[PDB]
């Protein structure tokens, strides 16, 4: 089913990184430039998940580089997280993409619950490899995937959870997605950073 036959018998991240760029799992490899694997190392505490890779990401091969990375730093400086001791990954590792004509990138498209359910055993590797003491998941993409199809985030917000189904039971704190407070009004961009922030403090203080 879906990556599993993919993943090697290993927890360097390095080789799962390698094996997941030779990844076929789902059809989302195809037109991606290349796998986006996690980045950080295997003594983070702190696990952050987002949805896939950007336009940015695709091409970088690195996770969080674009505008929503750029307000992520800025709200995990603001908590006093230090990126670097972060392992930060994406619950879909291929970039999913149309362009528009007269567009200025990539726009990205909601992995399919099935992509998702696919791709879960690079997730899954991950998550055994770095044994995080807390999960924190951007977005109802991330959020979904390991807390079910029908989990609402805007409903959970600052709440410390713990599913059963989940290797080394770890904290999951479920959050809004930092693409999200690059647009609208700015008294709502600003009251959803400081939420993002206590969110991020909630996952530190685990
Ligand atoms: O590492 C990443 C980078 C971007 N994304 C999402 C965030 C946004 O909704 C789109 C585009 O990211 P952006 O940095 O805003 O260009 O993809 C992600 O889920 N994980
Ligand atoms: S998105 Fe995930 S399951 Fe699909 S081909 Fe890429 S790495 Fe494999």
């Not at 995990?76 to 990138?105: M, P, Q, S, W």
């Not at 079910?148 to 080394?168: A, I, K, S, W, Y």
Request: glycine share 10%; charged share 25%.
């Amino acid at each position: 089913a879906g990556a599993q036959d993919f993943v090697p018998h290993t927890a360097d991240l390095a080789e799962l990184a390698a094996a997941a760029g030779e990844c076929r799992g789902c059809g989302l490899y195809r037109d991606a430039t290349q796998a986006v694997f996690g980045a950080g190392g295997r003594s983070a505490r702190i696990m952050m998940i987002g949805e896939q890779p950007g336009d940015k990401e695709d091409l970088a091969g690195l996770p969080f580089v674009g505008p929503a990375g750029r307000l992520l730093d800025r709200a995990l400086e603001a908590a006093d997280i230090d990126r670097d001791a972060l392992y930060v990954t994406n619950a879909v590792k291929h970039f999913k993409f149309t362009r528009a004509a007269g567009g200025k990138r990539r726009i990205h498209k909601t992995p399919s619950r099935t992509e998702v359910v696919a791709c879960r055993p690079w997730l899954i590797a991950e998550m055994t490899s770095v044994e995080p003491d807390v999960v924190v998941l951007l977005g109802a993409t991330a959020a979904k995937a390991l807390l079910g199809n029908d989990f609402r985030v805007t409903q959970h917000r600052g709440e410390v959870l713990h599913v059963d189904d989940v290797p080394g039971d770890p904290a999951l704190v479920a959050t809004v997605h930092p693409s999200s407070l690059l647009r609208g009004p700015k008294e709502e961009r600003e009251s959803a950073f400081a939420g993002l922030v206590d969110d991020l403090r909630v996952a530190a203080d685990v």
